[PDB]
Amino acid sequence: NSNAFKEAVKSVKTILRNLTDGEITISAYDTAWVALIDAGDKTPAFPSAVKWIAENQLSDGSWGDAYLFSYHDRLINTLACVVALRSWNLFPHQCNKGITFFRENIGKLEDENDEHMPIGFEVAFPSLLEIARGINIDVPYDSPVLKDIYAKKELKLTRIPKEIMHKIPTTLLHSLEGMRDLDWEKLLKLQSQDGSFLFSPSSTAFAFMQTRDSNCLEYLRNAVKRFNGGVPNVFPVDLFEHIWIVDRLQRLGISRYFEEEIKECLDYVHRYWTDNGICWARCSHVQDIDDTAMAFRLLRQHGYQVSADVFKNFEKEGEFFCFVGQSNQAVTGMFNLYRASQLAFPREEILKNAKEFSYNYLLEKREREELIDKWIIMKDLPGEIGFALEIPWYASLPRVETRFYIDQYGGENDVWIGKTLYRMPYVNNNGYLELAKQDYNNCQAQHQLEWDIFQKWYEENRLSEWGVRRSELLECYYLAAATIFESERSHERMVWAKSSVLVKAISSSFGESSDSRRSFSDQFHEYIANAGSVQASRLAGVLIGTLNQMSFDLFMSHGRDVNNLLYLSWGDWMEKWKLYGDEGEGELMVKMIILMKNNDLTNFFTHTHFVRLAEIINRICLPEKTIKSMEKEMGKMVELALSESDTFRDVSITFLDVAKAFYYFALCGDHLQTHISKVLFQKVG
Ligand SMILES: C=C1CC[C@H]2C(C)(C)CCC[C@]2(C)[C@H]1CCN(C)CCOP(=O)(O)OP(=O)(O)O
Numbered sequence: 001n002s003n004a005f006k007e008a009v010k011s012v013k014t015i016l017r018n019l020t021d022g023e024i025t026i027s028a029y030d031t032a033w034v035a036l037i038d039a040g041d042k043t044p045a046f047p048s049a050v051k052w053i054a055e056n057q058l059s060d061g062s063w064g065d066a067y068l069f070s071y072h073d074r075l076i077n078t079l080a081c082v083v084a085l086r087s088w089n090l091f092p093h094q095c096n097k098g099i100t101f102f103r104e105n106i107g108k109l110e111d112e113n114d115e116h117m118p119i120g121f122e123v124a125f126p127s128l129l130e131i132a133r134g135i136n137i138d139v140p141y142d143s144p145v146l147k148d149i150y151a152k153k154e155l156k157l158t159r160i161p162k163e164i165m166h167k168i169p170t171t172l173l174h175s176l177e178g179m180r181d182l183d184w185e186k187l188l189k190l191q192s193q194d195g196s197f198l199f200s201p202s203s204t205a206f207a208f209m210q211t212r213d214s215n216c217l218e219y220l221r222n223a224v225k226r227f228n229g230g231v232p233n234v235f236p237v238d239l240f241e242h243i244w245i246v247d248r249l250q251r252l253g254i255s256r257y258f259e260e261e262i263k264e265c266l267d268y269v270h271r272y273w274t275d276n277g278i279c280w281a282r283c284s285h286v287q288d289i290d291d292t293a294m295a296f297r298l299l300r301q302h303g304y305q306v307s308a309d310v311f312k313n314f315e316k317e318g319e320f321f322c323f324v325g326q327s328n329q330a331v332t333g334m335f336n337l338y339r340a341s342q343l344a345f346p347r348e349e350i351l352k353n354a355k356e357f358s359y360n361y362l363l364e365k366r367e368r369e370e371l372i373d374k375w376i377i378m379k380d381l382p383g384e385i386g387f388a389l390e391i392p393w394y395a396s397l398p399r400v401e402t403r404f405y406i407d408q409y410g411g412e413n414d415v416w417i418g419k420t421l422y423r424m425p426y427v428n429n430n431g432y433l434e435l436a437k438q439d440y441n442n443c444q445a446q447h448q449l450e451w452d453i454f455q456k457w458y459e460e461n462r463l464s465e466w467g468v469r470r471s472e473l474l475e476c477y478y479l480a481a482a483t484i485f486e487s488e489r490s491h492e493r494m495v496w497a498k499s500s501v502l503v504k505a506i507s508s509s510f511g512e513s514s515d516s517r518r519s520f521s522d523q524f525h526e527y528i529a530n531a532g533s534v535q536a537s538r539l540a541g542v543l544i545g546t547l548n549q550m551s552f553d554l555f556m557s558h559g560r561d562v563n564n565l566l567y568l569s570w571g572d573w574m575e576k577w578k579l580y581g582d583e584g585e586g587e588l589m590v591k592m593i594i595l596m597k598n599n600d601l602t603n604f605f606t607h608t609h610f611v612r613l614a615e616i617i618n619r620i621c622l623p624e625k626t627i628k629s630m631e632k633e634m635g636k637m638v639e640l641a642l643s644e645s646d647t648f649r650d651v652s653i654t655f656l657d658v659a660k661a662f663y664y665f666a667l668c669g670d671h672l673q674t675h676i677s678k679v680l681f682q683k684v685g
Contacts, residue, residue: 001442008435009257015426016245016261019268022237023426026230028053028063029419032080033177033202034220034231036087037209044088046220052229053081054091061101065421068377071105071112072121073421078102079128087135102139110145116374119419123178126153153178166190169285171323174198175419177206184211193283194236195219201231202419233418240280242269243294244427252409252436253402256486263302269295270304277310288322289314290333293340300343303642303649308348315350320357331365331373334358335385342393345639362389375417379410394634395664399482403679406436437684446487447680451477454497461542467508468501475669476500478676479661484593491557491596495550499592500585502543503573507582509539521574528567543570554596562595565602569595586621587614589658594651604651613640613655621662630663 035049044050058066064077078098085095126149133141140146157180165172166186173190176182176197188211191197195215196204201223208216223231242265249255255262272282277292292310299306313324320337322328338358344351362385365371371382378384387404414428415421458464458473480497510520523536527544547570551563573588590613594601604610620633637659641652668675 005435005438008431012431012435013258013261016258016265019242019245019265019426020238021226021235022232022241022424024232024234024237024424025065025422026052026056026227027201027233027418027420027422028056028077028230029080030200030202030205030233031230032077032084033205034224035084037205037220045217046224048224048229049231050084050088050090053084054094056230057081057094057098061097062105063098065415065423068415068421070116070421071109072116072118075102075106075109076118076121076125076128077420079125079132082137083128083132083135086137087131099137099139106140106143107145110148115372116377116417118417118421120175120178121419122149122152122156124175124419126150127178168325169198171198171286171326171328173286174200174203176203182210188213190285191215192285194222196235198286199234199236199281199284200419201235202233233420233422234280236281237424239269239272239278239282239295240291241424241426242266243291243298244424246298247294248409248427248432251402251405252432253398253406253485254432254436254439266298266302266304270299273299273306275307275310276313287313287324288333289320290322290330290336293333293336297336297340297343300642303644303646305643308344308351311350311354315353318353318357320354329361330375331362331371331381331385332376334361335388338362339388339393343638343642344635346635359389377415377417379413380408383408391664392667394631394660395667397479397482397660397664399485399679400664400675402436402440403684406433406440406684409433409436440684443485443487444680444683446490447481447485450481450490450494451680454494457498458501461545463501463505463542466505466539466542468505472504473501474676475665475672476504478672478680479665482675482679483657483661491550491554491598492593495592495596496589498546498550499589502546503582503585503588505539506543507577510536511577511582517574517578521571521578524574525571528571550596558598560600562602565595566592582623584614584618584621586617586658586662590614590617590651590654593654593658597650601651604648607648609640609644609648610651613637613652616640617655617659620659627666630666634659634663 031049031052034046035044035053037045039045053063057063062074062078063081064070064074078101082095082098082102085091085098129139129141129146129150132139157178160172160179164170166183169190173187174197176187184207187197187207191213192199195213195217196219197207197216201220204216205220207213208220220231223235226235246255246262246265249258249262269278272278273295274287277287277289278284278295279287279291289311292314296306296308296310311320314320314322320334322330322333335358337354341351341355341358344355362371366382366386366389369382371385373381384405387401391400409432410428411430411433412423412425412428415423454477455473458468463473464470477497480493480500484493484496506520510516519533520536520540523533524540524543527537527540547566548563551561551566555561555563569588569591573584576584591605594605616633616637620630620637637655641656644652
């Protein structure tokens with residue numbers, strides 16, 4: 001590992017250590033609504049917001065996202081800023097440059113498609129127009145395209161459930177700037193614990209203008225401080241940020257470098273977890289299935305005890321929804337629900353239904369090319385989801401998922417759509433992409449070495465004459481490396497790849513008759529005690545030779561002597577195999593891997609939990625109706641494997657790793673040449 005790299009890791013660590021209320025971009029629109037606020041004496045309550053606007057104008061006269069031009073974005077941002085500037089009679093030059101932009105550009109809005117269109121635009125846009133008309137700003141109010149949105153507003157305003165909106169919490173509280181006669185009597189009772197209206201600085205700034213409420217003021221005051229002048233279009237965004245950074249780091253395959261920092265993150269998220277789920281911000285009376293599903297999964301997969309009853313709230317009539325009691329469905333929310341529902345323990349019927357539903361939703365959405373999210377612009381959503389649709393979590397191996405995700409991750413070019421456009425530099429980062437591209441290529445270089453060495457070994461012991469095909473050789477190595485890929489873990493990887501090749505040699509050479517097995521087992525135990533049968537003795541020598549090479553290699557590195565335990569474990573497999581066909585092959589791979597771990601864990605081979613696990617892994621692994629029986633079994637394994645105190649964890653996971661490898665092979669074994677190719681033989685980039 002070079003120094004540029006070592007430094008990149010430090011930086012990412014200083015980010016994770018310093019996560020706060022969210023690293024989000026300023027929203028010219030939202031900071032213009034904050035800047036419209038009267039202290040009480042006809043002066044801006046928030047000077048710094050007025051100042052931000054005067055100093056962050058793009059050179060073509062507009063405000064908004066500088067690297068992605070959207071007529072919807074730039075028009076609503078500039079209008080708001082010009083209004084803010086003009087009603088304090090401040091900064092004439094920039095204000096004028098701003099109106100010129102708006103005039104020359106309002107005509108183009110009529111032709112951009114409403115496919116990527118901001119939240120509450122048809123309502124919030126005419127509202128500014130009015131404010132502007134009533135301060136004598138010279139803009140085309142008649143404009144063929146304008147009298148058109150004035151209309152869409154009034155018609156959008158009649159779909160609104162005014163009754164409900166005032167009685168119970170809904171997402172509408174986020175977009176109040178556009179609405180008319182509101183009962184602030186009833187609305188203030190729907191305020192959030194931080195004094196905002198659904199964590200929106202513009203909506204809250206509006207409410208304060210109308211109520212002079214002291215809590216809305218406190219919230220706006222913290223926002224203005226946090227971002228040194230400007231404000232985002234959502235705040236806080238802390239839960240969302242924690243959960244998304246973790247998810248990206250794990251998918252990009254570089255999660256292990258930051259194991260400790262990631263634990264602080266999930267710790268923070270568990271702190272503000274609730275029985276109703278969560279939303280993007282801590283302490284909310286509103287929750288969404290997207291944030292909740294991402295948290296549920298990341299938590300359960302890391303041994304936090306969370307409950308699936310959390311999903312009861314988003315379901316009606318066997319369907320699931322983004323927000324409680326709203327009819328909103330989004331592609332990315334269902335996607336994250338589908339990923340979460342696969343971590344279902346055998347008792348959770350709510351998650352069986354969640355899986356079945358989110359599967360079809362995404363399935364149909366695919367067969368209509370409608371796999372795009374209106375709310376977010378990503379490099380490759382259809383790709384991410386295609387992978388999840390064909391490679392179930394039970395069959396997803398670290399290196400395979402990661403290999404595909406590094407090509408899909410958009411880095412800094414991903415753009416989120418709220419009321420304006422905004423970016424999340426700590427979730428969508430080019431730095432993470434380069435780090436991941438460099439790390440992935442290094443481990444792959446290392447696997448290419450081990451694979452040449454591994455071929456030589458296969459030739460030198462003439463394993464081809466023992467019934468092991470070159471196809472099996474590569475498949476045995478690929479599964480080992482696609483699962484345990486870290487360069488610092490060659491021992492566990494190699495022992496796995498070799499042990500599997502050898503169980504294949506022994507099984508195809510001596511597994512036919514009910515005593516030819518005995519013959520080999522006897523030969524093995526004779527070969528042991530020196531501290532037809534001719535043939536058996538030669539194979540046994542290959543096994544023993546390989547066993548000795550590895551336990552000594554280990555002892556060379558760590559000073560552990562595991563030789564006897566290696567033999568014992570292979571003898572146990574035979575006692576079992578001797579009676580029937582190829583039986584407990586699964587349990588044996590787990591023991592090998594464990595025995596080659598840099599630290600000692602043999603203590604646990606005795607524990608009931610290890611025994612119970614071993615009992616299941618062996619019912620998964622055996623020489624369409626069976627694929628089903630596999631999920632059944634694996635279901636029993638997932639509960640047991642994850643719900644573990646963190647001493648035993650490294651054992652339980654290892655069980656999962658092996659089981660996944662088998663399932664994956666049962667599901668894809670027939671055509672693996674594409675995966676193998678991309679994973680082992682094609683550098684990223
Ligand atoms: C040489 C290969 C043939 C057989 C194949 C399987 C045995 C089916 C397993 C997947 C990879 C691979 C090894 C495969 C990959 C070779 N890899 C370097 C990828 C192909 O490389 P190339 O021949 O130089 O052409 P290029 O893509 O334009 O650069």
